[PDB]
A paper describes a structure:
Surface layers (S-layers) are resilient two-dimensional protein lattices that encapsulate many bacteria and most archaea. In archaea, S-layers usually form the only structural component of the cell wall and thus act as the final frontier between the cell and its environment. Sulfolobus acidocaldarius is a hyperthermophilic and acidophilic Crenarchaeon and thrives in acidic thermal soils and hot springs worldwide. The Sulfolobales S-layer lattice stands out from others because it is a two-component lattice, consisting of the S-layer-forming SlaA and the membrane anchor SlaB.
By combining SPA and STA with structural predictions, we built a complete S. acidocaldarius S-layer model. To get a handle on the structure of the entire S-layer, we used Alphafold v2.2.0 and SymmDock and predicted the monomeric and trimeric SlaB structure. The Alphafold predictions of the SlaB trimer superimposed remarkably well into the corresponding densities visible in our STA map at low threshold values, and flexible fitting using Namdinator further improved the fit. In the assembled lattice, SlaB trimers occupy alternating triangular pores around each hexagonal pore. The SlaB trimer has a tripod-like structure, with its long axis perpendicular to the planes formed by the membrane and SlaA. Three Ig-like domains branch away from the trimer’s symmetry axis and face the SlaA canopy, whereas three α-helices form a coiled coil, which at the predicted transmembrane region insert into the resolved exosome membrane. The lattice is a ~35-nm-thick macromolecular assembly, in which each SlaB trimer interacts with three SlaA dimers. This interaction may be mediated by the positively charged D6 dimerising domains of SlaA and the negatively charged N-terminal Ig-like D3 domains of SlaB. The new data confirm the overall p3 S-layer lattice symmetry, in which the unit cell contains one SlaB trimer and three SlaA dimers (SlaB3/3SlaA2).
Numbering used by the authors:
A (entry chain X), B (entry chain B): 424 to 475
């Protein structure tokens, strides 16, 4: 049982490590999709005002 | 073995808050990035359309 729990705590620790190595990666990654949305939007706007 | 179980549960609960604050936010980030990509691709065509 003891071996079972030790390895188990171990896997949790480990998956928190995947998610916390992921933490700055997924934030930067959100931050690139959101600037993409806004920079795309401000460029469409500026082309759309002069075609219309 | 008891104290280790209570700590496992604690750490699990922490990490479940973490990933449940991730999964919507990361979806929203991904939604914003694909939409930004739509807007940008449609901007490409409209600058291409208006020079022609």
């Amino acid at each position: 049982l003891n071996s079972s729990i030790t390895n188990l705590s171990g896997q949790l620790n480990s998956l928190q490590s995947k998610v916390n190595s992921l933490t700055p990666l997924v934030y930067g990654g959100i931050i690139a999709g959101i600037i993409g949305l806004i920079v795309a939007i401000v460029a469409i706007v500026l082309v759309y005002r002069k075609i219309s």
